[PDB]
Design a protein around this nucleic acid. Structure first.
Ligand SMILES: [Mg+2]
Ligand SMILES: [Mg+2]
Ligand SMILES: [Mg+2]
Ligand SMILES: [Mg+2]
Ligand SMILES: [Mg+2]
Ligand SMILES: [Mg+2]
Ligand SMILES: [Mg+2]
Ligand SMILES: [Mg+2]
Ligand SMILES: [Mg+2]
Lengths: 247, 166, 157
RNA sequence: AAAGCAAAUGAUUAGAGGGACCUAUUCUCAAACUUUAAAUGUGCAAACAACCCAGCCUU
RNA sequence: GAACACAAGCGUAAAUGCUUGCUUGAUUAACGAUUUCCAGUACGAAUCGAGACUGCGAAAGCAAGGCCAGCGAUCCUUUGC
RNA sequence: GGGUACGACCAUACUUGGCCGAAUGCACCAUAUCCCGUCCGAUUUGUGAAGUUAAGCGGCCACAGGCCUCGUUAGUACGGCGAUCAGUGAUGGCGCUGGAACCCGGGGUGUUGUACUCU
């Protein structure tokens, strides 16, 4: 018996193009672009984070009927312009690219002088001040806002997508979030370990693995300074976010 | 092409006993012994008076193995069947299987408590790059020529170890 | 036994079109509505929340109130010897913007452009000429039609 | 309404190519079947308590 | 072409279906407005809101029962604040 | 002349087979100390570059199916209004007017927005 006969093709209804290609989850997309009708089409921004086999992409997008409009994208392959030329896909790299896009967005908006964000890097939740979450005062200027979008990625504790989120938050952007997914979080005591989070941010785990690899290489470039240029790269990014590779 | 070769993906062992009592418990011990890996139980679907089983009742126990242990376990089974098979054992999908009647013959010290059981061996073969049909994002279909067919299956078998009777 | 439930006759009315099933798209979500606009009320049949009664399907009215996920519309309905202005509340998925006034607005814009061209001295486009007047008709050839008796044998199945 | 069953659901006649079976056809149908789809209908608009254009105030 | 407690229709595929994890939005809700029957009365059911305290989520968001059938005036008794 | 990310319309974009694919990229791909999750690192999660266009992807083709469009079917089927119209009836044509559907035939097989980019 043949099921794919002529009548089968007549009645077939094709799915959406980006659903056939397995790129867009429209069930989550509809809830993400939805906005209150009382606000008559006031802009709403998304923070799109995508990770390939060799690069990390962070974009700020505003949705329109004619097609989505992208403002101030950033890619992890521009890091060698600042002093990071290895890995480019680990947790440390994800933090750096999130910081770079936040500074670029703020500079373009002309608000980088204010909203400088935190400078000392540590794993601490703090909180995000939005219009619906005054966090006390409500008269000071409100920070620029965006909502995180992860697509089809699996959300687990210690995922690199949340590393991009932490970098953007520390850059000065206001993105609503909770510490439940940061690598140092323990769910049984519902607590977060600052030391664990900051270690992964500066790539402590990578150095230990690289060191151990060298030892096992014996009897079958150098660690202990990763925090060195990672801090130096942060200062360079906070100094000149707009510099790029021209050709 | 270097990655057009045929490799063994996984080997699945299944023990289909009736009842849901100590017989099942002992069979699980035997399987986890030979498999050095935790097995899982299976439950029926319908209720059959002829077979004397009810819906969603523990019946069988099985496990799957990938890697070197899969390779050596396969070798032991073929040794029991003296590397001799039949023509009607390979599917057009590109897989084949067989079955031993006594679990003693694999080289396991008999224990007077567990008893003697029989098992089923199934081997799945495929080339490298089938993950396109299993990844979460941008799932597609493997190419037709890239798929493994039955004729290449026996040729692979004879290459490593012959002895197929048509 | 007909029964007068809330949807007593909507087998074909509340059904999607052939090869057109699904939920509302993104362009429907970003419509935006304002008080005083003209909208059409049509049920979507895939969103059960906030569906209007079957009488108001395919009716046009004016919006009077906007809520975070709803729109209030004023619709005329005749009762006995008068017509009542009913107010209904629906979700934004069941309303579409109406094009019932676009011809009137275009005419007003054209008249405004006419005044601006005249006062700025711009030449005006030339007037269209009706074809209902007379004229000369010179044909290359004239055919005849005379019921050529092959049609009589033609209409036999 | 019409049309269709060489399109989904339901009913149904007979040959043919590879006793059931499969493929493509074929006779004949539907108030509680339908891809398609009229005529007659039905809602809104066709200006002054209004619409533009400019500048201005308030929350 | 399955399922969605039950009659039927409509609807639904990274779901409105199945499994699993955590929960009590089946609470309160200042006499807000509206639809269906219709006298434009009541009753039942349902739709769009505002305020409190919450649940699940990284978030946008969803939820004040199980979509549409499953119910009851005056007087009297009885409970809560 | 192209690639990637995010999209709008949602088959002229789908299904089957064959052939080709310069670069950037996208992939397949190596492995489990740590985060994390499984009967099984298959999927999922964390860290690398050893190989390869085989597949995925893009482009082209097919007396290919489907889909889209224009004709034909056809002023046919059906309809509104009229008659002291025809006919035993069943029904039908006429006057003023509106007007279909499948089969079949010709053609076609995605358009396009924002940003970073390769020749
Ligand atoms: Mg999701
Ligand atoms: Mg009807
Ligand atoms: Mg309809
Ligand atoms: Mg009929
Ligand atoms: Mg879901
Ligand atoms: Mg009810
Ligand atoms: Mg509330
Ligand atoms: Mg409800
Ligand atoms: Mg008369």
């Amino acid at each position: 018996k043949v099921v794919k006969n002529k009548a089968y093709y007549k009645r077939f209804q094709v799915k959406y193009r980006r659903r056939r290609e397995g790129k867009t989850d429209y069930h989550a997309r509809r809830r993400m672009v939805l906005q209150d009708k009382t606000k008559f089409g006031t802009p709403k921004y998304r923070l799109v984070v995508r990770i390939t086999n060799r690069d990390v992409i962070a974009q700020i997008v505003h949705a329109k009927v004619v097609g989505d409009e992208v403002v101030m994208a950033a890619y992890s392959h521009e890091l060698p312009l600042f002093g990071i030329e290895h890995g480019l896909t680990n947790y440390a790299a994800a933090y750096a690219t999130g910081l770079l896009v936040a500074r670029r967005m703020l500079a373009k908006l002309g608000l980088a002088e204010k909203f400088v964000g935190v400078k000392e890097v540590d794993g601490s939740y703090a909180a995000v001040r939005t219009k619906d979450d005054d966090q006390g005062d409500d008269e000071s200027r409100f920070p620029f806002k965006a909502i995180l979008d992860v697509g089809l990625a699996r959300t687990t504790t210690g995922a690199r997508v949340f590393g991009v989120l932490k970098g953007a938050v520390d850059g000065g952007l206001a993105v609503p979030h909770r510490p439940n997914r940061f690598p140092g979080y323990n769910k049984e005591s519902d607590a977060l370990n600052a030391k664990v989070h900051r270690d992964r941010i500066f790539g402590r785990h990578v150095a230990d693995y690289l060191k151990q690899v060298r030892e096992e290489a014996s009897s079958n470039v150098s660690p202990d300074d990763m925090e060195g240029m990672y801090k130096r790269a942060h200062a360079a990014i906070r100094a000149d976010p707009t510099k790029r590779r021209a050709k | 092409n270097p990655m057009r070769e045929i490799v063994v993906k996984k080997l699945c062992i299944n023990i289909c006993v009736g009842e849901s009592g100590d017989r099942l418990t002992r069979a699980s011990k035997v399987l986890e012994q030979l498999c050095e890996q935790t097995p899982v139980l299976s439950r029926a679907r319908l209720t059959v008076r002829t077979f004397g089983i009810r819906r969603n009742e523990k019946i069988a126990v099985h496990c799957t193995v990938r890697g070197k242990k899969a390779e050596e376990l396969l070798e032991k089974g073929l040794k029991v069947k003296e590397f001799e098979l039949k023509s009607y054992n390979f599917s057009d999908t590109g897989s084949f299987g067989f079955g031993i009647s006594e679990h003693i013959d694999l080289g396991i010290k008999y224990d007077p408590s567990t008893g003697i059981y029989g098992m089923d061996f199934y081997v799945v073969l495929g080339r490298r790059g089938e993950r396109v049909a299993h990844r979460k994002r941008r799932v597609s279909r493997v190419g037709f020529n890239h798929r493994v067919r039955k004729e290449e299956a026996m040729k692979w078998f004879e290459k490593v170890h012959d002895g197929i009777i048509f | 036994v007909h029964s007068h439930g809330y949807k007593c006759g909507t087998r074909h009315l509340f059904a999607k079109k052939f090869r057109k099933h699904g939920v509302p798209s993104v362009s429907t979500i970003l419509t935006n509505f304002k008080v005083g606009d003209y909208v059409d009320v049509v049920a979507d049949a895939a969103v059960r929340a906030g569906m209007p009664h079957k009488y108001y399907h395919g009716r046009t009215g004016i919006v009077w109130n906007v809520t975070p996920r709803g729109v209030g519309v004023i619709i005329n309905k005749p009762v006995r010897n008068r017509t009542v202005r009913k107010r209904i509340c629906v979700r934004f998925e069941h309303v579409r913007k109406s094009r019932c006034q676009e011809a009137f607005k275009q005419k007003l814009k054209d008249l405004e452009a006419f005044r601006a061209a005249k006062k700025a001295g711009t030449p005006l486009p030339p007037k269209k000429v009706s074809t209902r007047n007379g004229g000369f008709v010179c044909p290359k050839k004239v055919e005849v039609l005379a019921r050529r008796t092959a049609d009589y044998e033609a209409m036999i199945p």
